[PDB]
From a paper:
Yeast Ddi1 has three structural domains. It has an N-terminal UBL domain that shares only 14% sequence identity with ubiquitin. Yeast Ddi1 also bears a C-terminal UBA domain that is found only in plants, fungi, and invertebrates, but not in vertebrate Ddi1 orthologs.
Author numbering:
A (entry chain B): 188 to 325
B (entry chain A): 189 to 196, 199 to 246, 258 to 324
Amino acid sequence: RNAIEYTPEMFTQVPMLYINIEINNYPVKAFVDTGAQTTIMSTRLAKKTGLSRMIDKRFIGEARGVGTGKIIGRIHQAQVKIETQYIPCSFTVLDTDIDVLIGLDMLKRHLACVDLKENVLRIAEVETSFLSEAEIPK
Amino acid sequence: NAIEYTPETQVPMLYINIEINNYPVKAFVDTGAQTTIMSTRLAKKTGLSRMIDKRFIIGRIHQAQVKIETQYIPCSFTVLDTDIDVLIGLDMLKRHLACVDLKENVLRIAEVETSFLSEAEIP
């Protein structure tokens, strides 16, 4: 045509926020959820990583919206490796396909910045990239 | 030979103050949700019900301006019948290059910065 009109549009992928962490040298993809009141670890992962002895079965209850919601116990402290730093985290343990969900409690505790401009999570003294759609567990 | 009971501190959720068509709204900031949502009720009150696209959840609002501090930020909403009037999800946090800053307790979105609300102010 005699004239060419340019009408730009943005296309933005919106994958769920995940990061790579390590728990007792086991690589784990962790879900970053500011809408969660607690931080979760699956029974499968707690057992695999040798953290089951520290599942304190005095602390139960419900975490509605993940698995069956039935809490098995609390891991009061387990060191989580994020890049070059170990950081202490607490976990609500339940039967779920989500290995680790980092909730608002742990994000606040470690003064996190969830940076969607730069696509990274800054937590404690480290920075780690959000996973691409291809690396995200489904 | 056992008992169960509620213990004798809950983390407050992230909320911010926003205005839609001059109506003050307390918005839930949720990275666990892919999609930003607006209640049917708020769409009615703010005069956005006529902007709900119904082609296949009530529908989608494609562009509505959200006022944060002194600036307007265009957002899209999936309209549901819900108690939560606005839930800001990953789509709008990514679109507006946001930072959820828990060190300073603020949300940086588009070109503005706004404080998270106190526990007493949460809906």
